[PDB]
């Protein structure tokens, strides 16, 4: 398997352009293509992508026309243009999976053993990254339950080469934020972090309510992970922690107090200089 | 069953649990630690055991409902403090 | 003479040995900086109270 | 014997001698009792004691000297001498309050270290909840399709 | 201030005779300035200062010892005086009449608590206010 | 550094009519590089202004590159490294304060860089310390 996948801004923009292109030329529920990258240990780096013609029935959910001939032709073309890139996965712009995704992944695994599916949400979210990485693993469930071929989440990240990075910075210079910690921005960052934590807790809570009422089955792995969460919750009422926390707060605040004292002294010196300059100027103007 | 807030367990209450006198709860906890099920420490000076890990196991619907209630409380606290902080710093948020 | 970090007790007859945490250098540097700013304030007096 | 000395559990010397004393009752060393140069039995006893010390230091924070002695199968003073020798050799860390016999393996707790541990717990919690929300998104986002 | 130097010496010594003689000698300045009500409230706080020092340089002193050291008539009188010291908050100490001794507040290492935070908070707010006032008073005549 | 170019016609150049009409104040507003001037920025060809069609969706998806996760936002900087950095900065600030006093005293007696460096150091100290303290409180009363 593969432990991490890092997508590139070029891939992101190609996917967005493909989806917008298909939507402009006609309403559709999804758009599909292939992902070219390179392997360095179990850290896939999706450095490029390209669309492929694709349509499916929304009702039967079992009929679709991915074009393998198109796929192989353009893969060979991109191989000619640039060598060190090989089929590593496929992407689709679907907010939800479908009963076809497994069949299309079966089709792709012929081209790649460790083919990675990537769901790219052209709709801009606000909390997490727009790309989700999945891999199809089928095995005899040690849980003793019937085994069904299904995907598995793969850690995803966004990373760029120096080329794409300079390009994106030049594009974003208008709204790009300071690449340095300014107090107001840090406070806003904490607020945004609280937003994200609240949203994640709400999602987990909704799933737990669904399971408790019974609309869904129970995932032992999910229960295990939430057990680990609740068990990993810290305890902040312990005296041997309260004392240490007070000590560190006092240290930080003594540093802050010294800083403020220096800043006030400098401000007073500046005001003294301004008063002297103003009086000298007025005296000279009068005489 | 014991939450992280007061996760400290005592020799006496373990004895009131599965029938054993309090001279071998130490060995029982030792076997658990060794086989790699629970993690923590044993303070027999005060006759207590501190746990900070438990091998997760499949659970029941009532247990999941209680866990849902706990997460209700946690999420409510998170939202409350988020509102507090944003309201307080409203004049510096970018 | 500070040969080892411990304090006696001639009552129960004990020698409480331990490790003394290193002196926090931050409060040091802060104290000398406070002294420097005090003498800077003296200079600001000498400027203002005599030129105004 | 090898399984016991490779497993992470305390084995009482009394039980081990009432189990595996067959040696020399077979093999060529560690005699149960023999000529002086080959009565290493005492060395084996010391090895059992040292293994017990290691296990206790790994799985305790405050073990009273009485309990430590009655668990190690040595007098209180003998255990004190052995533990002091280990501490001097630097093999084990253990601070002995002999006023109340409160042998403690808890290394002094720096506030830096305590808050770093708390922050690490928080980071692990956040990563775990993020991964769980991803997995649960996939779970519901597949099954509710049915 | 020499008359007040004499008064301070008399109070520190705790000598009522010296207090009375200095009061009689320097009553003139006492109308000149105005302290009589305060100067009898003095005698009050003379005994108060005695008890405050007795509690300052001790941790578990007994009522009998307090009476002996303050020359108070009775241990019950000393008990009343220490209770009034509690009123004034000038000893900040407990007491136990079951055995008859005045225990003191168990002194705590005051750095793992919010007192340093509060002090630094007041000083930081003051420094910020000075900076604000300075940068506002910065003026340009044009 | 990107450029767009198109050629000029020899017949028009010889006729003298300018290679490209100028009906609006646009198109200009750009300083042509001396390199291109030498290589014929006007004798043989002419430059064209380059605009970028930055859609809002593409801008968002680009932002996603360095967008910071809520983990990063709400995490705590290591306390040991934090204390070490605080000490480094405080000692440098002490030295700068000594130099600042020397400068101000000599200025007053006779009648700056130390002040600027002192301001920078005080600002960094204040921001880092306040940020970490606030994050610590947020965490300690959000996670329990």
Curated annotation (Swiss-Prot), chain A:
Q: What GO MF terms are annotated?
A: protein homodimerization activity
Q: Which family does it belong to?
A: Belongs to the peptidase M67A family.
Which biological processes are named by the entry's GO terms?
proteasome-mediated ubiquitin-dependent protein catabolic process
Q: Which UniProt keywords apply?
A: Acetylation, Isopeptide bond, Proteasome, Ubl conjugation
Q: How does it assemble?
A: Component of the 19S proteasome regulatory particle complex. The 26S proteasome consists of a 20S core particle (CP) and two 19S regulatory subunits (RP). The regulatory particle is made of a lid composed of 9 subunits including PSMD7, a base containing 6 ATPases and few additional components. Within the complex, PSMD7 interacts with subunit PSMD4 through their respective MPN domain. Interacts with TRIM5.
Name the PROSITE patterns on file.
MPN
Q: What else is known?
A: Does not bind a metal ion.
Chain ranges passing through the membrane: none
Task: List the Pfam families hit by this protein, alphabetically.
Answer: JAB, MitMem_reg
Check the record and name the PANTHER family matching this protein: 26S PROTEASOME NON-ATPASE REGULATORY SUBUNIT 7 (PTHR10540:SF7), EUKARYOTIC TRANSLATION INITIATION FACTOR 3 SUBUNIT F-RELATED (PTHR10540)
Q: Which InterPro entries match?
A: EIF3F/CSN6-like_C (IPR024969), JAMM/MPN+_dom (IPR000555), MPN (IPR037518), MPN_RPN7_8 (IPR033858)
> Keyword Ubl conjugation: yes or no?
yes
Using the record's annotation, list all stretches that form the MPN domain.
5-140
Q: Which organism is it from?
A: Homo sapiens (Human)
Where are the N6-acetyllysine residues found in this chain?
200, 210
According to UniProt, the name of this protein is 26S proteasome non-ATPase regulatory subunit 7
Example GO CC term: the record gives: cytosol
Which Gene3D superfamilies does the protein's record reference?
A: Cytidine Deaminase, domain 2 (3.40.140.10)
Q: Where is this cross-link: Glycyl lysine isopeptide (Lys-Gly) (interchain with G-Cter in ubiquitin)?
A: 176
Swiss-Prot record, chain B:
Protein's organism: Homo sapiens (Human)
What does the UniProt record say this protein does? Answer: Component of the 26S proteasome, a multiprotein complex involved in the ATP-dependent degradation of ubiquitinated proteins. This complex plays a key role in the maintenance of protein homeostasis by removing misfolded or damaged proteins, which could impair cellular functions, and by removing proteins whose functions are no longer required. Therefore, the proteasome participates in numerous cellular processes, including cell cycle progression, apoptosis, or DNA damage repair.
Know the name of this protein? 26S proteasome non-ATPase regulatory subunit 13
- List the taxonomic lineage: Eukaryota, Metazoa, Chordata, Craniata, Vertebrata
- Describe its assembly: Component of the 19S proteasome regulatory particle complex. The 26S proteasome consists of a 20S core particle (CP) and two 19S regulatory subunits (RP). The regulatory particle is made of a lid composed of 9 subunits including PSMD13, a base containing 6 ATPases and few additional components.
- Sites of the modification N6-acetyllysine? 16
* Gene name of this polypeptide: PSMD13
Q: Which family does it belong to?
A: Belongs to the proteasome subunit S11 family.
Indicate the span of the full protein covered. 283 to 376 of 376
From Swiss-Prot, chain C:
Q: How is it modified after translation?
A: Phosphorylated by AMPK.
Q: What is the annotated tissue distribution of the protein whose record heads this document?
A: Highly expressed in embryonic stem cells (ESCs). Expression decreases as ESCs differentiate.
Q: What induces it?
A: By FOXO4; expression in embryonic stem cells (ESCs) is mediated by FOXO4.
Where does it reside? Nucleus; Cytoplasm, Cytosol
Superkingdom assignment: Eukaryota
Q: State what this protein does.
A: Component of the 26S proteasome, a multiprotein complex involved in the ATP-dependent degradation of ubiquitinated proteins. This complex plays a key role in the maintenance of protein homeostasis by removing misfolded or damaged proteins, which could impair cellular functions, and by removing proteins whose functions are no longer required. Therefore, the proteasome participates in numerous cellular processes, including cell cycle progression, apoptosis, or DNA damage repair. In the complex, PSMD11 is required for proteasome assembly.
Which family does the similarity line name? Belongs to the proteasome subunit S9 family.
Assembly and partners are described as: Component of the 19S proteasome regulatory particle complex. The 26S proteasome consists of a 20S core particle (CP) and two 19S regulatory subunits (RP). The regulatory particle is made of a lid composed of 9 subunits including PSMD11, a base containing 6 ATPases and few additional components.
What is this protein called in UniProt? 26S proteasome non-ATPase regulatory subunit 11
Q: What organism is this sequence from?
A: Homo sapiens (Human)
> According to the record, which residues of the full protein are present here?
371 to 422 of 422
Swiss-Prot record, chain E:
Q: Which residues carry this modification: Phosphoserine?
A: 62, 74
> Could you tell me which residue ranges the PCI domain spans?
1-109
Query: Which regions span the lipid bilayer?
Result: none
Q: Where is the signal peptide?
A: none
What is the role of the protein in this entry? Component of the 26S proteasome, a multiprotein complex involved in the ATP-dependent degradation of ubiquitinated proteins. This complex plays a key role in the maintenance of protein homeostasis by removing misfolded or damaged proteins, which could impair cellular functions, and by removing proteins whose functions are no longer required. Therefore, the proteasome participates in numerous cellular processes, including cell cycle progression, apoptosis, or DNA damage repair.
Q: Which family does it belong to?
A: Belongs to the proteasome subunit S3 family.
Q: How does it assemble?
A: Component of the 19S proteasome regulatory particle complex. The 26S proteasome consists of a 20S core particle (CP) and two 19S regulatory subunits (RP). The regulatory particle is made of a lid composed of 9 subunits including PSMD3, a base containing 6 ATPases and few additional components. Interacts with UBQLN1 (via ubiquitin-like domain). Interacts with ERCC6.
The protein in question is named 26S proteasome non-ATPase regulatory subunit 3
Tell me the organism.
Homo sapiens (Human)
Q: What is the lineage of its organism?
A: Eukaryota, Metazoa, Chordata, Craniata, Vertebrata
């Amino acid at each position: 398997a593969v432990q991490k996948v890092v997508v590139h801004p070029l891939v992101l923009l190609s996917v967005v352009d493909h989806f917008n292109r298909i939507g402009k030329v006609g309403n559709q529920k999804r758009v599909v293509g292939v992902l070219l990258g390179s392997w360095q240990k179990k850290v896939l780096d999706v450095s490029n992508s390209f669309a492929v013609p694709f349509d499916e029935d929304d009702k039967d959910d079992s009929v679709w026309f991915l074009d393998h001939d198109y796929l192989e032709n353009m893969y060979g073309m991109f191989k000619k243009v640039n060598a060190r890139e090989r089929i590593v996965g496929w992407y689709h712009t679907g907010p939800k999976l479908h009963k076809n995704d497994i069949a299309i992944n079966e089709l792709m695994k012929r081209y790649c053993p460790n083919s990675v599916l990537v769901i790219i949400d052209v709709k801009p979210k606000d909390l997490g990254l727009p790309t989700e990485a999945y891999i199809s693993v089928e095995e005899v469930h040690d849980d003793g339950t019937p085994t069904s071929k299904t995907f598995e989440h793969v850690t995803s990240e966004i990373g760029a080469e120096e080329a794409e990075e300079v390009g994106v910075e030049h594009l974003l210079r208008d709204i790009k934020d300071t690449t340095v910690g300014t107090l107001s921005q840090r406070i806003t960052n904490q607020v945004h972090g609280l937003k994200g934590l609240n949203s994640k807790l709400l999602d987990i809570r909704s799933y737990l309510e669904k399971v408790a009422t019974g609309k869904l089955p129970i995932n032992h792995q999910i229960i295990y992970q939430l057990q680990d969460v609740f068990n990993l919750l810290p305890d902040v009422s312990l005296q041997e922690f309260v004392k240490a926390f007070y000590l560190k707060t006092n240290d930080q605040m003594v540093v802050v107090y010294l800083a403020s004292l220096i800043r006030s002294v400098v401000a007073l010196h500046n005001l003294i200089n301004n008063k002297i300059a103003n009086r000298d100027a007025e005296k000279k103007e009068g005489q | 069953t014991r939450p992280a807030n007061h996760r400290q367990l005592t020799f006496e209450e373990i004895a009131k649990s599965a029938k054993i006198t309090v001279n071998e709860v130490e060995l029982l906890v030792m076997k658990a630690l060794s086989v790699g099920l629970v993690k923590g420490s044993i303070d027999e000076v005060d006759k207590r055991v501190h746990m900070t890990w438990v091998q997760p196991r499949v659970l029941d619907l009532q247990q999941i409902k209680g866990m849902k209630d706990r997460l209700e409380f946690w999420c409510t606290d998170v939202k409350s403090m988020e509102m507090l902080v944003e309201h307080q710093a409203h004049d510096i948020l970018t | 003479d500070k040969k080892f970090h411990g304090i006696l007790d001639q009552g129960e007859g004990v020698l409480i040995i331990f490790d003394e945490p290193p002196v926090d250098k931050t409060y040091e540097a802060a104290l000398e900086t406070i002294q420097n700013m005090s003498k800077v304030v003296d200079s600001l007096y000498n400027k203002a109270k005599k030129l105004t | 014997l090898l399984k016991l000395f490779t497993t992470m559990e305390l084995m009482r010397w009394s039980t081990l001698v009432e189990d595996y004393g067959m040696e020399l009752r077979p093999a060529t060393d560690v005699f149960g009792s023999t000529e002086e140069g080959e009565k290493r039995w005492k060395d084996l006893k010391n090895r059992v004691v040292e293994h017990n010390i290691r296990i206790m230091a790994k799985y305790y924070t405050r073990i009273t000297m009485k309990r430590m002695a009655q668990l190690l199968d040595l007098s209180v003073d003998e255990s004190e001498a052995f533990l002091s020798n280990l501490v001097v050799n630097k093999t084990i860390f253990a601070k002995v309050d002999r006023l109340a016999g409160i042998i403690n393996f808890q290394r002094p707790k720096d506030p830096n270290n305590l808050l770093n541990d708390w922050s690490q717990k928080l980071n692990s919690l956040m990563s775990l909840v993020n991964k769980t929300t991803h997995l649960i998104a996939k779970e519901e986002m597949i099954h509710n399709l049915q | 201030l020499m008359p007040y130097f004499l008064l301070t010496q008399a109070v520190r010594t705790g000598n009522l005779a010296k207090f009375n003689q200095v009061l009689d000698q320097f009553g003139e300045k006492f109308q000149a300035d105005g302290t009589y009500t305060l100067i009898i409230r003095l005698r009050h706080n003379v005994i108060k200062t005695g008890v405050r020092m007795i509690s300052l340089s001790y941790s578990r002193i007994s009522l009998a010892d307090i009476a002996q050291k303050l020359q108070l008539d009775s241990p019950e009188d000393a008990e009343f005086i220490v209770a009034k010291a509690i009123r004034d908050g000038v000893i900040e100490a407990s007491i136990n009449h079951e055995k008859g001794y005045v225990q003191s507040k168990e002194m705590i290492d005051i750095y793992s608590t919010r007192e340093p935070q509060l002090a630094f908070h007041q000083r930081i707010s003051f420094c910020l206010d000075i900076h604000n006032m300075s940068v506002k008073a910065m003026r340009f005549p044009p | 550094v990107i450029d767009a170019f198109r050629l000029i016609n020899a017949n028009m150049m010889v006729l003298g009519h300018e290679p490209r009409q100028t009906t609006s104040n646009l198109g200009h507003l750009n300083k042509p590089s001396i390199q291109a001037l030498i290589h014929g920025l006007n004798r043989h060809y002419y430059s064209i202004t380059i605009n970028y069609r930055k859609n809002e969706l593409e801008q968002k998806m680009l932002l996603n590159l360095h967008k910071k996760s809520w983990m990063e936002g709400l995490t705590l900087q290591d306390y040991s490294e934090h204390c070490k950095h605080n000490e480094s900065v405080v000692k440098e600030m002490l030295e700068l304060a000594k130099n600042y006093n020397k400068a101000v005293e000599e200025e007053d007696k006779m009648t700056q860089d130390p002040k600027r460096h002192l301001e920078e150091h005080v600002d960094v100290l204040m921001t880092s310390n306040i940020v970490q303290c606030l994050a610590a409180m947020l965490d300690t009363v959000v996670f329990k």
